[PDB]
Amino acid sequence: GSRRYDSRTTIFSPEGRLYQVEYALESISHAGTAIGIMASDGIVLAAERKVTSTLLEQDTSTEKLYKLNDKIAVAVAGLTADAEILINTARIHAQNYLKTYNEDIPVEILVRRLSDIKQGYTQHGGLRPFGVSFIYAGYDDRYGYQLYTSNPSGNYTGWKAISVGANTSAAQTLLQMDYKDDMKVDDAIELALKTLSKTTDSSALTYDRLEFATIRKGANDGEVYQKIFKPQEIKDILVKTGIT
Amino acid sequence: TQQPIVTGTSVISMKYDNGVIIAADNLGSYGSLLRFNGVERLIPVGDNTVVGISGDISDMQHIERLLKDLVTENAYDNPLADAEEALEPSYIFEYLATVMYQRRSKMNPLWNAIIVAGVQSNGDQFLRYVNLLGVTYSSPTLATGFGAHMANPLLRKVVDRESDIPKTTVQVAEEAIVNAMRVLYYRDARSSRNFSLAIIDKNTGLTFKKNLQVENMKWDFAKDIKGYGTQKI
Amino acid sequence: TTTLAFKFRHGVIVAADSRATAGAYIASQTVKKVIEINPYLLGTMAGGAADCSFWERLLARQCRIYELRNKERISVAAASKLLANMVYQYKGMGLSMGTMICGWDKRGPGLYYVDSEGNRISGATFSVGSGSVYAYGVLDSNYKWDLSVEDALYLGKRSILAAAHRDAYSGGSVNLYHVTEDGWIYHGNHDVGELFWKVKEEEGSFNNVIG
Amino acid sequence: GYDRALSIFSPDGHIFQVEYALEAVKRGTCAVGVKGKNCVVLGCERRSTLKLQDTRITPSKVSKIDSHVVLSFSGLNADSRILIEKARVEAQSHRLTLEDPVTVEYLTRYVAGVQQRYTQSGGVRPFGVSTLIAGFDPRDDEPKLYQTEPSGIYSSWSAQTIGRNSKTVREFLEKNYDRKEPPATVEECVKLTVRSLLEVVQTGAKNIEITVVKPDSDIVALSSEEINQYVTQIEQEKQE
Amino acid sequence: MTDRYSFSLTTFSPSGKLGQIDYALTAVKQGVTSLGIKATNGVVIATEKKSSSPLAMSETLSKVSLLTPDIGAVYSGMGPDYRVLVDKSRKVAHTSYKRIYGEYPPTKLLVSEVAKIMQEATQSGGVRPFGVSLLIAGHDEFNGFSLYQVDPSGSYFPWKATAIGKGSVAAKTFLEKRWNDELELEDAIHIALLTLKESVEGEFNGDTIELAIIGDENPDLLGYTGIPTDKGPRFRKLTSQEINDRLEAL
Amino acid sequence: QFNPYGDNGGTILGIAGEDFAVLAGDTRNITDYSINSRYEPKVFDCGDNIVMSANGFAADGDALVKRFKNSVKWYHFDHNDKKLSINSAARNIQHLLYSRRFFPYYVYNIIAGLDEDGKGAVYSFDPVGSYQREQCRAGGAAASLIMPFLDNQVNFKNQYEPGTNGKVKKPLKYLSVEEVIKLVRDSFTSATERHIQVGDGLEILIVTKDGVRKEFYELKRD
Amino acid sequence: NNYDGDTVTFSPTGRLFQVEYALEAIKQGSVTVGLRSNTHAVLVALKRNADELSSYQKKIIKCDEHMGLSLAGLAPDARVLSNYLRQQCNYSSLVFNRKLAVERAGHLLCDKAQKNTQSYGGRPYGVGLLIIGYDKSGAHLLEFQPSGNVTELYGTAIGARSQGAKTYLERTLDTFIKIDGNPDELIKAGVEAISQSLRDESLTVDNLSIAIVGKDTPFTIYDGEAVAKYI
Amino acid sequence: DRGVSTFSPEGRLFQVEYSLEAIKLGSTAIGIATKEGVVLGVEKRATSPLLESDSIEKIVEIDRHIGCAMSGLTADARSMIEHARTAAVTHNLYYDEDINVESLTQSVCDLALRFGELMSRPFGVALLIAGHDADDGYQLFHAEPSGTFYRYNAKAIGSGSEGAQAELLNEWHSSLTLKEAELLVLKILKQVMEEKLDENNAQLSCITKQDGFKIYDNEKTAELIKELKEKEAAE
Ligand SMILES: [Cl-]
Ligand SMILES: [Mg+2]
Ligand SMILES: [Mg+2]
Ligand SMILES: [Mg+2]
Ligand SMILES: [Mg+2]
């Protein structure tokens, strides 16, 4: 019967690892690097688009940075199509919570929900897992500014600074070196771009090969503003920090 | 739940020494309209059973098809279908009785009253009633609808109890049935003169008589009846 | 029907009549309205006999699997609640129940009223049935906590008698039960006919009745 | 639906998927449980390969199932969340139907049953998780400590450890823990729990988490400084 | 019976590759060349009508398809897979948008819905990925003109101009030299015809080329008058004669 | 509107002796003012020394009896041909009845036999499965005519010993099978006189350790 | 070899190996004998024990008052099939007030076993059955194989060493068929038949199991001291 | 790979035969049936001294008149016990009586072969079901994952089974007392166990008509162990 052709996606190896999760992580390690840095007065999200073309319409393009709601955003590393499936689920979950409790969803609760979905594909159903790793950047009134990451295993952890995708080993070392607790957003912006500039596989880091975003309390009085940077604005911040 | 539309009236029957007799008129009424005059309401099953049905005719036609299918199904992988493993009156009845009670228990009944008349393998007479409620009973005489009220009294004068059955011949039993059918024609407003009669004997087998008519009727005395009390002319 | 139950220092008394009626006709007069659920648990019957008996036997089953799974006798609160939740599924569907779950657990003697309408009430004194209203008068006036077991049994017996006399649909005989921490003890079947004349003479009550 | 039998017997009478789930537990960070005379202490290892971590928001290793019961684990982190959620739902369901909080033994029996169910159900793999469940029964002052594993078996322990290098810390506990006289106070119990982790942990900095559970729903998690004081005192006595 | 293939047929290999998606992309590579170019006042999509037989009526086989009045699509790869995707794309534009908002979806969201369908064939049980890459050109009020590519993985990218299929690498190089941000629609059509001639071997005329545009509103193609706000479809398929006229000025 | 229920009349009576039991019932079947049958058996031998009668709506009665007989058959299959005790049968029948708690069997059922100590046993049921053990119990149309007479002549209610004047009750002396059948016959003869649905015939089933015996007696046919 | 992984796969020579392996389980099972005359039908079964402390596994199952069988192979599979027969016999009685014909009972077992041989996921039944019964056409004996094949016979035997008993019955055919109105002599012929399949062990009081059905004889099983008469 | 419900060429179900190998690895359990009662005893086999041995529950009550001992993958037994308890209590609900030990055992054994591609594999545990009823008296059954159950006068399952069964072969007779059976289980357990038998690593139980199913205290068993040592030293 059909058993003959079943790959068995949800099984342990003799060493106690999940084959497909490990291979999904291998896939993600070839994806464009995405970096998240948390400061006292905001969060930075920086990400590298993969070998683009001159004919790609950049200003209407979105492959890395996505908006989940007004307070929470994500950086993607892996299969974009898989990520969009999950992103739409997360958007719906945030709205369900808002409808139920009449309050914006706490960041961790949203993260846990998505991570539980990822976990389900590793334990039952016989389907391949989502080949995606997220960096969640968000704010709420309980814990303030938060950075999380999730991977195809469905495991998630909190961070002060973190990278996903390609060259995370090198990137995480560079972040661990220059990061300090009393750091500010403008400094974190500089750190993120400098780290990408050193870890990139490209010859030089340019505006057309980047997506950038910030979550700031730099909004008029006690409230939070999401800023998805435009191509021209990424070009300006690259000059300001002294990379181009 | 429904209501009956095209209906058939009384079915009457009785046991005699060597078998059973059953009869029913050929009318299919549509309320007070005597719509269909060529309706057969006695349906033979093999050469040993006759099922007489009253009530809703569309449900009768459904039952008629179930019995036809029952014969077909019994013959499947059955080398003794025309001998030891042929359908018995008791098998046919119990099947119908099961269906009728199940249908009432789903609040969607077959709006009928049925009498299964026949002779068993061992020669025993079979005569049992069943209706839309799944209610079953047996008796030396059985009748449905108006027949219960008018025919049974006449038929019970011939066979009042079990011990009168061996003393009753086929000629006497048929005479009583034919007389009962005349009485029902006098008094049942939903009856017809034309009827069918079936005899199932353990010796002579199944005799099915069609196109019978009520005869030897008394009407002459009507000429002398004038007015409703005081009128003389 | 008349059923009652009450908590007191030495446990809980349970009493009931035995009459069953079909309109004005008395179908039976030997009905067991005190339901022996298990050796440490009692229940009462009022409203639908079938309903009360069936669901409380189905409860006994639940209470026993509990005792197996957990190696511990179920509490009166948990027992009453399993019953209440079970009958709550069939709310508005026709069930007629009015029961009292009587027992002794870690919290001491326990008594819960449970009905098909959805109520579940802990209390020290209950009486349900068409004759409840006659029984309450005698209970409320003589009920204490420092009640001797001998006196408490008589009270529950006298309270049923009061109802059996006045209520047409209550009568027959009185069944008595006493629940201890060591389990329940049956205290007999008492014909109301004989009991009435006895009580009238010894007590002086029912003066208006000629005997 | 996906019905495939993943957990099946092999010729030698082994269910490899269940045994491979134990290997995932062996990879997991070390967790330890020690019960004193009037308390239970749960210790957990945090691997220091991950720095730049936000310790405020990162999922804690010890999870409250109810106000009187806690659960720690070793193995796949994602898998543990599913067991904890189920356990928490059951704890509220028990209070709702029976009007009493779960006993520690009951809660352990439930979680162990879930783990077992995933070893003979079609289309699913076993949980790569072993748990330590600790607490106090309602209106009881006897400490309770249980352990579960992927196969579904569970048991009670005076002291126990699971996860990576659990063999070493179990060795330590077996010679240091006396049944006739267990840790009489909270200090003694925590000290023994920290001592045991120091055999394996590496640095006694932010790598050790301690959670003390006392009777009547009195649960508290120690801070870095409080733990660091234990680490200091232990090694100063060791220099002799 | 019952579909007993409830497990994924596309899975990660040790290297992290999703084999079936790669192989689907290989099928797209073998397919006939198709392209899209975006102008300031329109978009053009074009491809070769590779006739399997001269007895076959190639007019009956439409490689360029209308999805909505303002959105069109062309493909490279497996024809039958494209045909069913067009049927689904047309339907989803109604069920998940028009029946809700009373208007046709913007290009990017329709593309998003098609991409979702293709992604699910890459993860769901007992199916293979679609063996096509789509080029979807469209217009909507708030986003203006746009051109998107959709791959077997479900990934989609917006383009100023691009090509897919047989000679895509050469064609994309040709487009990079010719494209600018000041092109008029007629200039884009001219460049489309030049680019497409390089990948075509045999006959090059209006009967062997299929070409459509997203441009100005066509009130003559609406089918009714009386509602000022309804001005007609922006999608228009060029005729055989209209193509040949522009091949003389080539 | 379709009424799924009916009333086939009939009356039944179960009396429990010291080492025997009887279950009697008339043989008349009726609808409204018509007679369907003068002899339609209503009391049945169900096996394992148990007799049963489901009085009221005949279609529901026939179904319940049929199901219980089936239940006895499967009890033998499932439990190594073990004899179904009268108390076990009673509890089983409760569950058969309550299975249709929201579309009941419109019948008042009575069973009779011997308990596990060999003593006579009768059990009565209501339409939804409430059951209870009894010594003397009539069911059906003329139950109210019969039971007051049995209260007086079996249990000796309201009867006191002459000379004492209400101080000493008449003692509850055990009755023989012959004495019981006399009371049964006189009960049905009296019911036949004053109830129109009672008559034609009377069939009694007697249960002893030796087995199940039948007795039939004619009743008035008017 | 490569075509025995499941029941849904024919071999190149048109064989179904999973069915053949199920057939093999019957050959490993203990011997049982079936035979009939024109008035009665008899089952004789050699029961098997695990050891001296263990009981002897029951081989004969009653299906109705007029029908029953003996088993050889996987006992749980016999329990499933006998339960099915019990239900079918019972359906015939409740609905049609009709005792189920033995031939039709065979047709029903054949069809139930067949469905397990043509579908994926399931397995064939691992048991052989000898059905005896008395119906409206007299006494009957059937042999059921889990391939689906059901065969009406005068006599037969299945299980380990069953060929010896089958040869004996083939010689005795003309004699035992004529044993009408004599149950004890028909059982004797069955006990003598099953004795041809014995080696080392002999028929003891808790070893032997006998069943009979006939004209005025309900299906009854004899075990223990009830079969000492025939030893 | 291959079907879960596949027959081997010899006519055996692969998975059932493989589950039997898992049972051979399990701790020893012994049952002895007498006319005064049935005794059930088990080896606890704690994997560490820190493990509180009284939490090891390998002997279990099904009803007041039926007890049960297990050997093999003990986690698999929990749902079997649960079904057995439900079956016992449900029969009491339907029939107002205790359920026959054989009928209970049959109900448990019906679950056994409900596996395929229902549960995904057979049970990896064997059960000794001991009890009493009025019809067949004191009984001991051995329930396997094959769906087969044999009645036994005495039976041992687990790692030391064939050695213990040979010992039970010689020692059992129809006139054994309850006290004699208790010592006999302790004797054979002490023989096949790796560690030295005491009240903490071994457990006794019995089922009598009067008192029903009882698990023995460690103090009660300790005395029976001391009584055993003295009687073995007596000759
Ligand atoms: Cl066998
Ligand atoms: Mg007529
Ligand atoms: Mg409940
Ligand atoms: Mg009164
Ligand atoms: Mg009259």
Contact A214, A188 (CB under 8 A): no
Strand, helix or coil for residue G136: coil
User: Residue A148 is inside which H or E element, if any?
Assistant: strand A144-150
Cβ partners under 8 Å of residue G87, min gap 6: none
Chain C residues whose CB is inside 8 A of the F97 CB are 50
Residue H142: half-sphere exposure toward Cβ, Cα within 13 Å: 26
Is C49 annotated as ligand-binding?
yes
The answer, for B102 touching chain F at a CB cutoff of 8 Å, is no
Which homologous superfamily is A1-244 in? Aminohydrolase, N-terminal nucleophile (Ntn) domain (3.60.20.10)
Q: Which residue of F has its CA nearest to C31?
A: F132
Q: E249 phi and psi, to 5 degrees?
A: -95, 45
The answer, for B101 touching chain G at a CB cutoff of 8 Å, is no
Q: How far is the CA of C77 from the centre of ligand 3 (A)?
A: 12
Strand, helix or coil for residue H60: strand
The answer, for F99 touching chain B at a CB cutoff of 8 Å, is no
The answer, for D106 touching chain H at a CB cutoff of 8 Å, is no
Quote the CA–CA distance of A159 and A138 in Å, as a whole number: 12
Which one-letter DSSP state was computed for residue G182?
-
Taking an 8 Å cut-off on Cβ atoms, the answer to whether A2 and G121 are in contact is no
Taking an 8 Å cut-off on Cβ atoms, the answer to whether F85 and H100 are in contact is no
- How far CA H139 is from CA of H2, H101, H132, in Å, comes to 40, 7, 6
The answer, for C68 touching chain H at a CB cutoff of 8 Å, is yes
Q: G103 phi and psi, to 5 degrees?
A: -65, -40
Chains with ≥3 CB–CB distances under 8 Å to G = A, B, F, H
CATH code for the domain in which residue C120 is found: 3.60.20.10
Q: Helices E168-178 and E185-199 sit at what angle, rounded to 10 degrees?
A: 150
- Which CATH number, 3.20.20.10, 3.60.20.10, 1.20.120.550, 3.40.50.920, labels domain H1-235? 3.60.20.10
Taking only Cα atoms into account, the Rg of chain G, rounded to an integer number of angstroms, comes to: 18
User: Are A and F close enough to touch, i.e. 3+ CB pairs under 8 angstroms?
Assistant: no
Residue C171 gets the label, from left (phi > 0), alpha (psi -120 to 50) or beta, of: left
**What type of residue sits at position E67?**
L
- How far CA B87 is from CA of B128, B199, E12, G85, G105, in Å, comes to 16, 18, 66, 22, 17
Chain B residues whose CB is inside 8 A of the F61 CB are none
Quote the CA–CA distance of D68 and D137 in Å, as a whole number: 7
Taking an 8 Å cut-off on Cβ atoms, the answer to whether H85 and C58 are in contact is no
Quote the CA–CA distance of A169 and G117 in Å, as a whole number: 57
Number of C-beta neighbours around residue F110 at 10 A: 27
Quote the CA–CA distance of E209 and E193 in Å, as a whole number: 9
Cβ partners under 8 Å of residue D171, min gap 6: none
Retrieve residue C176's tokens.
């008595």
Structural domain harbouring C57: 1-211
- Which CATH number, 3.30.70.980, 3.60.20.10, 3.30.420.40, 3.40.50.300, labels domain F1-222? 3.60.20.10
Buried b (16+ CB within 10 A) or exposed e, C1-14: bbbbbbbbebbbbb
Cβ partners under 8 Å of residue A54, min gap 6: E176
In angstroms, how far is the first alpha carbon of chain C from the final one? 26
Q: Which residue of B has its CA nearest to F7?
A: B135
Quote the CA–CA distance of D161 and D200 in Å, as a whole number: 12
Taking an 8 Å cut-off on Cβ atoms, the answer to whether F79 and H100 are in contact is yes
Cβ partners under 8 Å of residue A131, min gap 6: A24, A27, A28, A78, A79, A82, A152, E12, E16, E18
Q: Residues, chain A, total?
A: 244
Taking an 8 Å cut-off on Cβ atoms, the answer to whether G53 and H113 are in contact is no
Cβ partners under 8 Å of residue H213, min gap 6: H61, H62, H63, H64, H65, H66, H67, H131, H205, H206, H207
Chains with ≥3 CB–CB distances under 8 Å to C = D, F, H
Q: Where are the domains of chain A?
A: 1-244
Contact D12, D106 (CB under 8 A): no
Strand, helix or coil for residue G54: strand
- Taken in order of first residue, the domains within chain E and their CATH numbers are 1-250 (3.60.20.10)
Taking an 8 Å cut-off on Cβ atoms, the answer to whether H120 and D116 are in contact is no
The answer, for D4 touching chain E at a CB cutoff of 8 Å, is yes
Q: Name G217's bridge partners.
A: G214
Give the position of tokens 């069915």.
Answer: G19
Structural domain harbouring G63: 1-231
Decide if B168 is catalytic.
no
Q: Which residue of B has its CA nearest to F2?
A: B1
Residue H96 gets the label, from left (phi > 0), alpha (psi -120 to 50) or beta, of: left
Taking an 8 Å cut-off on Cβ atoms, the answer to whether A123 and D6 are in contact is no
Residue closest to H38 by CA, chosen among H224, H206, H200, H152: H206
User: Are B and F close enough to touch, i.e. 3+ CB pairs under 8 angstroms?
Assistant: yes
Reduce the secondary structure of chain F to three states and give it as a string: CCCCCCCCCCEEEEEECCCCEEEEEECCEEECCEEEECCCCCCEEEECCEEEEEEECHHHHHHHHHHHHHHHHHHHHHCCCCCCCHHHHHHHHHHHHHCCCCCCCCEEEEEEEECCCCCEEEEEECCCCCEEEECEEEEECCHHHHHHHHHHHCCCCCCECCCCCCCCECCCCCCCHHHHHHHHHHHHHHHHHHCCCCCCEEEEEEEECCEEEEEEEECCCC
The answer, for A142 touching chain H at a CB cutoff of 8 Å, is no
Report the residue from A26, A81, A129 with minimal CB separation from E16: A26
Quote the CA–CA distance of F21 and D139 in Å, as a whole number: 57
The answer, for F216 touching chain C at a CB cutoff of 8 Å, is no
Give the position of tokens 């739940």.
Answer: B1
Q: Residues, chain B, total?
A: 233
Retrieve residue G16's tokens.
């179904």
Quote the CA–CA distance of G66 and G131 in Å, as a whole number: 11
**Distance from the Cα of residue H230 to its chain's centroid:** 27
Give the closest-approach CA distance of F55 to chain C in angstroms: 15
Mode of pairing for the β-strands spanning G138-144 and F201-208: unpaired
Per-chain residues with Cβ under 5 A from ion ligand 2: B 9-10, 25
User: How many distinct structural domains can be found in chain D?
Assistant: 1
In angstroms, how far is the first alpha carbon of chain H from the final one? 59
User: How many distinct structural domains can be found in chain C?
Assistant: 1
CATH code for the domain in which residue D61 is found: 3.60.20.10
Q: Which residue of A has its CA nearest to H4?
A: A3
In angstroms, how far is the first alpha carbon of chain A from the final one? 61
Report the residue from F98, F134, F144 with minimal CB separation from C54: F98
- Taken in order of first residue, the domains within chain B and their CATH numbers are 1-233 (3.60.20.10)
Q: Where are the domains of chain F?
A: 1-222
Provide DSSP, A83-128.
HHHHHHHHHHHHHHHHHHHSSPPPHHHHHHHHHHHHHHHHHBSSPP
Provide DSSP, chain B.
-----EEE--EEEEEETTEEEEEEE--EEETTEEEES----EEE-TTSEEEEEEEEHHHHHHHHHHHHHHHHHHHTT-TTTTTTTSPPHHHHHHHHHHHHHHHHHTT----EEEEEEEE-TTS-EEEEEEETT--EEE-SEEE-THHHHHHHHHHTTT--SGGGSTT--HHHHHHHHHHHHHHHHHH-TT--SEEEEEEEETTTEEEEEEEEE--S---GGGGG--SSSS---
The answer, for F36 touching chain B at a CB cutoff of 8 Å, is yes
Give alpha helix (H) positions in E121-233.
Answer: 168-178, 185-199
Residue closest to B120 by CA, chosen among D109, G136, G41, A113: G136
Quote the CA–CA distance of H100 and D2 in Å, as a whole number: 39
Residue closest to G44 by CA, chosen among G125, G127, G162: G162
Q: How far is the CA of F191 from the centre of ligand 5 (A)?
A: 14
Quote the CA–CA distance of A114 and A188 in Å, as a whole number: 27
**What type of residue sits at position G71?**
L
Q: Which residue of D has its CA nearest to E8?
A: D2
Q: E21 phi and psi, to 5 degrees?
A: -70, -45
The answer, for A5 touching chain G at a CB cutoff of 8 Å, is no
Quote the CA–CA distance of B50 and B210 in Å, as a whole number: 14
In angstroms, how far is the first alpha carbon of chain B from the final one? 53
Taking an 8 Å cut-off on Cβ atoms, the answer to whether F78 and H103 are in contact is yes
**Distance from the Cα of residue D35 to its chain's centroid:** 12
Give the closest-approach CA distance of G120 to chain A in angstroms: 6
CATH code for the domain in which residue G115 is found: 3.60.20.10
- How far CA F194 is from CA of C110, F9, F37, F141, in Å, comes to 53, 14, 20, 11
Q: What angle do CA D111, D116, D122 make, to 5 degrees?
A: 125
Determined by X-ray
Q: How far is the CA of B151 from the centre of ligand 2 (A)?
A: 10
The answer, for B136 touching chain F at a CB cutoff of 8 Å, is yes
Ligand number nearest CA of C90 is 3
User: Residue C137 is inside which H or E element, if any?
Assistant: helix C132-142
Q: What angle do CA B146, B152, B154 make, to 5 degrees?
A: 115
Q: How far is the CA of F95 from the centre of ligand 2 (A)?
A: 44
Chain E residues whose CB is inside 8 A of the A24 CB are 12, 16
Quote the CA–CA distance of B194 and H181 in Å, as a whole number: 89
The answer, for D6 touching chain E at a CB cutoff of 8 Å, is no
Q: Interface of chain H against chain A, CB under 8 Å?
A: 1, 3, 117
Quote the CA–CA distance of C56 and C44 in Å, as a whole number: 9
Please give the interface size between A and E, counted as residue pairs whose CB atoms are below 8 Å apart: 108
Strand order in the sheet with C173-180: C125-128, C3-8, C11-16, C173-180, C183-191
Q: Which residue of D has its CA nearest to E125?
A: D2
Give alpha helix (H) positions in D177-239.
Answer: 186-197, 224-238
In angstroms, how far is the first alpha carbon of chain E from the final one? 58
Residue closest to H6 by CA, chosen among G18, G76, G8: G18
Q: Where are the domains of chain H?
A: 1-235
Report the residue from G27, G53, G57 with minimal CB separation from H168: G53
- How many helices (H) and strands (E) in chain C? 5, 12
Chain G residues whose CB is inside 8 A of the A1 CB are 6, 8, 120-121
Q: Which residue of A has its CA nearest to D18?
A: A12
Chain A residues whose CB is inside 8 A of the E179 CB are 55
Quote the CA–CA distance of H103 and F76 in Å, as a whole number: 11
Taking an 8 Å cut-off on Cβ atoms, the answer to whether G104 and B77 are in contact is yes
